[PDB]
């Protein structure tokens, strides 16, 4: 029998004949002995029992920079509502009864962690209505402006040696983006605004919470009022959009960053034979995750593990350094120059695609949320004051071809180097040279350095920031756009896309029960921050489709003159033509990670195959694993890109689907097919211009299938050299009128759709032809 | 029912089917069988009577004259019974159970209803041409029946079965419209107005050069007229050269070609189409045979499923500007105009013009053009096109698909019938019920992206929401290569030869490019005639008169020259492009000087594959004949899952007017009540040849030989020693690319070696012998009196804020603009491209690449190797590089020498045919063929070799696909085995001898040839399969020094053919054959050709590939040069031949045995000592 | 049918008057006969 | 058929050249198929 979620707290079971079981509608929130403010966040089936995640709309969390116990629930005003994971069972019809109830307590904070948290600042979440221009921030100081000062041009050649930028050909390379304007950056104790600038290069107060609350917020309220009578020339009102992505409010005002971080961090559920794993959502970053031992006592506090303590394998040692060297500056000299890189932490947040389990293994994926240092000096003063220190790390044109050599390339490892370079009859934004290489021949090794003047080394305060997108540098320039859309190509006979190693990074992997126990120890460590190691992980440069932006039509080395033009080179300039329910065409999104075991037989004496699929902007990604080792699939040749990752573009039908309305991902064991359910009723009621939405009705379903030569099929296929892929195809189940309840996969050859057009229910039976549906009107009972 | 000895086996020419290897419980074979009776003359049947009353008259005659069946053979190849529908007296259908499952006992046989199958009287006399077996249902088979007429097509009377081309002096230009358009004095207000000022909006740079042109479009309010419609503006009109010189299908097509039967005619005349009959068969039972379902392959099922944009093919998504530009330029309009492809049109050549395009054109008021109106010219599926789509069945699940054949059943010398799509017969209720449908390949191949191939990239295989690219095939077959379902053969690409557009005033001097765009010259190869090209093929007619005189070198519209191209400098871009900001109702024509050669032209305006599906902004036209090899792995479960009918939306339709067209998007969200997007990703992966790209591929083309000779294109084994035809390595001089254009950031960027040296190749430009690294602006293009172009002139300069006024042109330029130029550093100066390389591969295999001719072999007009052909003086006219007229991508002299047109390579006595770059007087040349008649439709049986490999007969070569299913690093992935028979190689109809290819028990594929079966041509010029109407070329006298510094200048060639009598005689294949010493059979035998012996390490070119010491192209050339005498090691060689007595007609193949003509059937020695114990004891 | 997983049954009862095993006529409102199948009742 | 006590069989041999099972065509005069009927041959 199949289970259906009637609403945010009720669950109704159906027989395989698409008929509802009488007296089966159960209120699990009531059953779990939880109050009205709670609703079911995620549900999964393990060991035949139903595991349910619950989260309260009434949760309140505080961050106190002073003290030992910094992150805590606000007891005082009935905000001590932690999230719970409950095991339920059938005691028979359907009669649910609670087995175990686990609470997810806030994270513990060390002395070292709290020194980053004290001055940690966070970007306002990205919305359905957030533009390329809202995201855009004013360009920072160039390399020669930081280390040398103003009017120090054509003196670079003689002075670059002292500042340890020996032979560096890019004085004009940007050092980051200014934080005096643009999208709001807030402390954990501070709250985010309902307003978002239309142009971040001009409107906005960035990290200046004080300057916003005193003067700018009032201009914003006047331009962009809530419900319209408003002008909407400088600002967008996204209260409705924010609310739809899980933002908690005290009427009109959102709760502080820390509360939003908690509520969104308890979004996805995975269950193994010994552990329960809880991660965040795809909308906003997750700085921690929960590992709950299933053997935990009735009233014990289950604490999360920080991502800043979870050391991942980025594929290569160099790939990890790239991410870390940009997290901050690593030479305190000051005293309060605390950031993540200095306090010896790793990547602190991820925008989680999802989490699942196969053969007691946990599988995760997501995009790495951009993180860089920033100056907070407050005065003469430092040249980098009120600015983020981020840069492009895209592989140089002169680099050796072959995946391993492209990703290990020392281009932009310690400091900035990319810009705009004229090559023959075209151009590039990536530095043409690395090592001893110059146009004349060999000139001595090229050096890079963190954008901090060595004279101002002591009198500088480099603290930490976290972005709401997979973008590290938002600085309004050429290279920012090519790194975001994947438009950097080499010029050698065999073309290759030069990847970035900090911007639009997709991280994925498989976690063992012992790798999870390690994670649990780190959460329970008191005093020192204990470090975790996840071996079977990988990273891959996954950018947004270039054709989601107006003005770009191909991806080649040769670039047309019109493509050096400002209108299609900077963020504010760039215009979106993306149809996937996002106003921006620059930041990538991922959702619906689901793994499954292949029904097709494998060679005798070999373990059954299993893979995972996930949806990203522009296509479907497939994660390939070796079952004989429960590791990521790999191959002998380093020149070929890790065979554990595959990407297949969408067509206009799949691109048309609003990725922000993802409801549920399912997998049919007998078919080997994934059903992606999108409910249009998950749309915000109003635009950024407060205009009522008129397309929040209906649904859509996408089928995902395996393609390619699979492992251990025969003597030849015991090893692979090509990554097996996936195929996303609009199933044929869709509506614009009906409001979906759920989809029953009745059989391999049949499916049932439960919906309401005018309150009354309707069961639609669709004919299934190996992932392709067509409605049966005869099957109406 | 008993085996009739008078009926012997045969092979149908369209699908090359002869017999089916039957597997499972009861193995054996199901082979074709026919009466080999002569004393048959179709002449008796008299032609008033229309095409249909005549055809039934031929049918009734052939019925009492010809006998056909499909006999069943056991595993030993011994025949068992016949199954002859015409001799079947009172046939019966199977007795089905209560679930539709037929009643059957292994011994008693099948249960018979006694009642004959549906439409039996019309299918009764049909000829079975193919047999396929059910994959999961036992004893279930399916036959492909066609009418007896389909087999005797070419033997029908000439008044009924026609040619698409002409039969006192011969002139190839008579049927061509060559008179260039002129200035319209009345329409001078229809000129695109220059803007008043650029926009500053944070810009800074400035220029004195003429401002951008403005193109305004406004809707307003009027049902039939727009407020503004500047794309409709046309300040030019046709020439009045003793009449208006335009495309008129009525004036120009008197005895116009029309198909045998229209689409409607075939669908209503059930005996004139193709049928599929499902049948039952169990040989070791009493009732061994029984019939099931009879389904007619209705053409309307395919036509009803054609994209909506196909109802109006004389139009495309660019609308009125492109209709006008192409129209005046005396070109075909749209994406599939009937003047180029009359085979898919019910009224054939009657509709072969640009008139009635489905949208209003040429209105007295221009703001009325572009609006949707009535048409009567849609892409349909008539007789010739229809039967070419018949053959190659596949049984996947409960479905039977027909992917079509090579089209040899209905193919004429000047016609190219091909398969447009796939047909599906979906069976239900234990095969008791059936449903017929058709899907066009255009939809099915919509999902193609570059990541799906390991060979050539950016091939013209792209498309859009309006399905403008119309892929059609010459199918080999569709077979399971292990786990993977593979569809192979040759494929028609998007057009590349007519991508460049001529400047309105150049038509007369560029006759071959005009011919090609007019459907007169059915050539698909890019011809090198670039002087007259317009800088951009997307410039509307409104902008063509801006610089009529030509003194200011028309910034918007000028004669294409990549020397006068501008910088990419931020200030050049600011001043001349970003300054002008387009709006909702206005677009600009920038004063920026864009220009580039064949590579550049194709990069911007060809339907090149990207990383995304349906991303082709421009699909020019569609090729005449299949011009690419093709193998693709299909999605079997998508083919069986997809719905019968396909629903398109308003997104697949062209805009009703120019206002709606103006702000169109290349991609749109499909309607929720449509399913057309579901059909896009049926192809999983594809291959077009060996796994090589760009310059690396060229090296391989040199390595292969020409069938007619056996001599390579390289001419490498023994400065005045011949040079290669397709490669630049060691040809010309070594130019340092760090000294070209901006001369910055080049050293390690393109070459991973210190030395940035690149071979110029034949026909280069240098300042002097000493100065070979970059040519300074001293090939500066001058224009007609007060001539020189002036860099440093007020217009040709950009002043940024601060006043440093700098010129926009480049100081130095690459050292070659020849048809062989291959610049890794300059795309604007590259002529060699991937689309040409793909065509050049297939053509060289067929051995049909044309050569440019000046001197025939005749007296007082001969070409002498010594003193006339200097291989050392390749920079000058002595080298004899035409630079105008020849095939782009090669060295014309190197090809002539390979063809042995001059030299001892083909004839002991030198034929003295060639090309002389004249320094004396104006040259007059014509392109001619090789003497070979192989066609890109000469595609045989698909032959699965093993679990990882497959191959087929393509012309005189057996091509094998080594590295497609599971590719290996370092291999080319292709094997080639050439036929040895010189009479077949040099035959007029060479593919008439081909009698099918089969995989043998020893594990090698073999092919049957019967040279006695060679058909003779029925026939100033004489039509053969490789006949092309090449137009004359006339150029000014060549310079003695600094020859190729400039693009070679042509002159009016409209009155030139009258002095080319000798040359024009060589357009007929038989006349080339005669001069080459191949005149007549001067012999053969009929036997079987076997492939070259191949080992797992055959094709290992890994050593030749990669490296930085020498560039990949340079390392492969040295490697191929070290392997000239052991080509068998790379997998290029000659096929071995075994003589066979008598006349080869077919083969009977069982999973145990392959018997030619079904001879040699034995008892099998192994199982002779094993028997049953008799029941009595 | 083992493959289809379909079971066709007929209900029977022992009549007190006559020792015989009589079929239960009201068992399915259509008669004593009934079928047991999963979703392939789509026939 | 258990009631009729009839057995319908087909003789198969493993071929050396093609390493798979092939039917013995000469097993009976008619083919590789034969019946084992207990005098219910009428």
Residue numbers in the entry:
A (entry chain A): 27 to 118, 121 to 255, 261 to 412, 416 to 817
B (entry chain B): 59 to 105, 108 to 227, 232 to 782, 789 to 1089, 1097 to 1159, 1164 to 1258
C (entry chain H): 1308 to 1350
D (entry chain B): 1308 to 1349
What does the paper say about this structure?
This complex is formed by two heterodimers, each consisting of proteins P110 and P1401–6. Here, we address the structure and mechanism of the Nap adhesion complex and reveal an intricate interplay between P110 and P140.
Crystals were obtained from the extracellular region of P140 (residues 23–1351), both alone and in complex with the N-terminal domain of P110 (P110N: residues 23–827). With four heterodimers in the asymmetric unit, the P140–P110N crystals were refined at 2.65 Å resolution to a final model with agreement R and Rfree factors of 18.7 and 22.4, respectively. The binding site for the sialylated oligosaccharides, identified in the structure of P1106, is located at the interface between P140 and P110 in the crystal structure of the P140–P110N complex. Strains expressing the P110-RQD variant protein, which was barely detectable, showed a null binding capacity phenotype. The “closed” conformation corresponds to a state in which the tight interaction of the extracellular regions of P140 and P110 occlude the cell receptor-binding site.
